[PDB]
Design a protein around this ligand. Structure first.
Ligand SMILES: [Ca+2]
Lengths: 271, 279, 279, 280, 279
């Protein structure tokens, strides 16, 4: 899996803490994923290319830099070997939500003499923690969409690809390649990961984003077993499309933000 | 019941797992229902025909491909009483269900088909009136008919309240039906009958209006318990499990201003156990 | 006496009576429905009001009967329990739980009949705006308090409204006490359940006001309201009579002309009763 | 001293007093109501404000009395418990629970009287926009903190507003402490419950601001607010006085002319009290 | 150093210190933070300068008085160790916090300054993008910088991410700061750092959009518990308690159509206990 770097010089692991009261040592990993909104030039990191509109389904050829893609990373863990790292809990929030209080830069005035238009409209907030790559199912608004070089989209789509077509199974195995609009986490798989997403659609939808270091998601299933890290690898996945930025011209760009992860792991004996 | 296929080549059962630690054997059935929004041509699977408007109640003849219909399927289960003696009935009991709508991110395509929100703007998101509904039962879902307009003339290929009257716009107890055909019972004509469905659990939210935002959640960590107050889930009569859905996500608005319903498939993971019952 | 929707005879709105008897603490379930009373301006528009007037000065406000939604109510007769008991023993039916939902919420997905196009080439306008959803289960008729938008409103023949209203009738006037003793007569806009009484009933209501309010309605056979108070006592059925009350104004229907009508739906009730010893 | 809505005598807004006493731990329930104080611009428009002015410069902002909704409050007198007790024994009434709802929420379904048509041939405009729903139960008067949109506002005779306001009065100015000691005098726009005080009361408020905000109002006789703190102690009625406070601005009524008036409704209270032994 | 809003001396924003006492004495500290919205002149305390619009990302130079900043204060606490022998460390531990925004009803003034909503109408309520945030810690709040536009040129009197790059619009780990100065860290530049703040609890909700209604609750019955999973609250390491807030309520629209941020103060009641710790 070719994800965002989680070792070496550009590593997005900010801290590793070990809590050891003699038995059942907990390892906490603090890391982040950057959004992959399309980045139309070197200065507009975290934005998409301006959106096209009204393309007939027969001639729908979106530009690469217009398509937000899923973020993912493989975090390498110490080799234990059968003892496996088990993901127990995750704290996660979107980083930089207050940046949207800048109404002076770039955004269309709401009216004569007014401030800039806030980022608003369709948003998607999603994260996953797994012991293997996230498993995706493809579903398309329009099966005839012609997707650009550098994206991975449902192969040999049909009209059924607009509903459920079981041919479209993929691993989230490349960062910044699987367009959010083409793929969802596969509810029929991901037996070894936990995923969470909310889509809110509409022109005037307000973004609502919460931050707190007091909220924890438990990753243990009903049997008290968390995701188990195959090949000593921990997989984090995100999509955080916050809404649409409206320029003075009236053009619209997706805006995305990074997601923080604190994952608590323990060593677990397994068959 | 003539539903979406759940055996053979086109079966919409994706996986059957059996968890057997000697005693409490659980069978998990993973399946999906496709939406039945009307499918106006071979390319627009999951959409309706464009919506007509302002038909007088006296001349209201909606086209078949304009009407979303309920989805349903019969899942066949192993026979349990094949190797048992008289007086012993083992039945499959639906204990829990995990369900979510499949492909909710597809609505982040604002480049294809949808009217610009304003000059130089992106496409209009799918929005407006939506209905999200699912049912798990040991027999076909039981429906009650209610009509906006009793005089509506419904097209060939649909099953709608027979001999409607003005009372059919409120409660008319004549309009009882089994959801016994997939893609035939128009969502606008039928609701789950609260007076029946003693052997199923159903769940539905209608949200009406022009600008209603769709709000859809996905997670493999949420489970609905199907057991009643006595700890009994739906019991599968004739070794048949029934899943039913309607997932009208909202209205798609074309450049022209024409509007089509957009629907998505629903996933089901149903946990079943064997239960001893009298006779 | 209470002159409600019929709950015995040929036109009875009791759909089923089940008795669950495992030797002790027999439960009787009553399944019934109330139809909405939105005004029914002609024989074809059952469940709708007359079109809404606007801008009447408070000094000349004379709304038409068929424009005013009214509260629904019914007396359900129960078996006599004291026919076969000796003196000093009073057995009463006690309402323990209620399952209730609005019947036919999907009927609002008909956007082809009657409703004004949302824009050129568009579908019909969904029902939306001000709504009120209310139900009560009691052992006696529901007790009402009158409050008026405008005390000078002149209410039509066939309605019962606050007698001798004053400016204080626009806030709290304690003269305006009434029993919900007639179906389709007490205008919703004039009356609320009296929080100062109803010691022997449970009531529940949500008002949502505004032009563009989206309707949100849930259906499920898995949700139960417990009617027991802190002491574990439900409503007690005086004179062996169970009282159900409802108002389900779903929002406003907008015609092609731009005229608006209230749309209402029926409400289902499943009430669990047990026999209780009382002094 | 608190000059509130009448809660004894001929005009008393106590509707019922029920006593439940099974020999021990007697509960007294007090049922009462507060009327809204929206401004009442003439004798016929009880429950409404004067039409709203707009665009007054901060330097010349002189709102009319009948344009300002005010807090409602009342002192309910309770029996003395200490008349036949000896020195060193103090019994006080303790507020344990409250059931409260807004009275007359369905009155807003009158779209035929007074309200501007929503469009040609349409019904009247529903009441909507900025609303405030607030209630308090206490063993002493409600304690208020003043905060002003505009400190230079000149408030009319008949109102009590922050004395000698400053620019800091638009944020937190600790000079602006008051008791809610007069019904229909403390303008809602000038005052909030003081979170730094009210140790002997429980208060609850939601403000929702905006042009198109829908009113959402619930009624049920099955919902109870527990007034007990973490130690299981409710407000103590220290001079045998129970204090109820409310503000229920439901939104704006729009006339045919386009003028806007606040519309308010009364609030019902059922308060359960018990007798509690307290130290001298 | 933390140069915050005064919490000792004549201008102290500590309103009360209560002690509840035989063994586990609780000290309650009641204080407030004022908002720092920019205060464009001596009369407009709690407001920002009118907002500019449409600055190209390459020429974005916002004025100081246009930028809301985070509020913070260091509250000094009694020394506990003055009469203890070495190897014994008593520290103040923050257990709970009650907090609300002060003066939410001030937004019911629709007569002063605000543009009429329409001819003959009242003033436009404050509405749009808002941010409500508070923190309680035993050390200064730790911030991460993120920018809408990395090329923004921030005015003298602010502290903003040093040497920003395109990555500063997403996650750039160079932008670490302590909230060490009141009215200097612009809200739009900084968030609490989830990678740090091991010794504080923070809570924030951003709601963006033109027409967002402000929703604000007040009650003295709601408490936030600050204890972690081990039952340990923030520990005030140098006998210093840190409170931080940002309460941008929305936009005020003048008659001209110009817009200003409006902010309000936040109250804090913090319950502290003495806790024995290792040196
Ligand atoms: Ca009573």
């Amino acid at each position: 899996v070719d994800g965002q770097p989680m070792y070496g010089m550009e590593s997005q692991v900010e801290e590793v803490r070990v809590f050891d009261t003699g038995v059942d040592a907990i390892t906490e990993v603090e890391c982040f994923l950057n959004p992959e909104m399309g980045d139309p030039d070197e200065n507009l990191r975290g934005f998409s290319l301006k959106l096209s509109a009204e393309n007939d389904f027969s001639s729908d050829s979106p530009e690469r830099k217009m398509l937000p893609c899923y973020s993912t990373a493989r975090i390498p863990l110490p080799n234990l070997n059968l003892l496996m790292w088990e993901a127990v809990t995750v704290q996660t929030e979107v980083i930089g939500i207050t940046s949207m209080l800048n109404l002076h830069a770039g955004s269309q005035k709401v009216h004569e003499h007014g401030g800039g238009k806030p980022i608003q409209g369709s948003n998607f907030h999603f994260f996953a923690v797994g012991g293997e790559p996230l498993e995706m199912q493809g579903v398309l608004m329009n099966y005839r969409s012609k997707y650009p070089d550098g994206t991975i989209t449902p192969k040999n789509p049909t009209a059924q690809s607009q509903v459920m077509n079981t041919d479209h199974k993929a691993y989230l195995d490349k960062n910044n390649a699987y367009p959010v609009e083409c793929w969802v986490p596969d509810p029929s798989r991901n037996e070894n990961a936990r995923y969470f997403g909310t889509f809110t659609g509409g022109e005037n939808v307000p973004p609502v984003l919460h931050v707190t270091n007091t909220a924890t998601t438990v990753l243990l299933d009903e049997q008290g077993v968390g995701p188990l890290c195959k090949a000593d690898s921990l997989y984090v996945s995100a999509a955080d499309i916050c809404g649409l930025f409206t320029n003075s011209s009236g053009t619209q760009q997706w805006r995305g933000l990074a997601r923080y992860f604190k994952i608590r792991l323990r060593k677990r004996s397994v068959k």
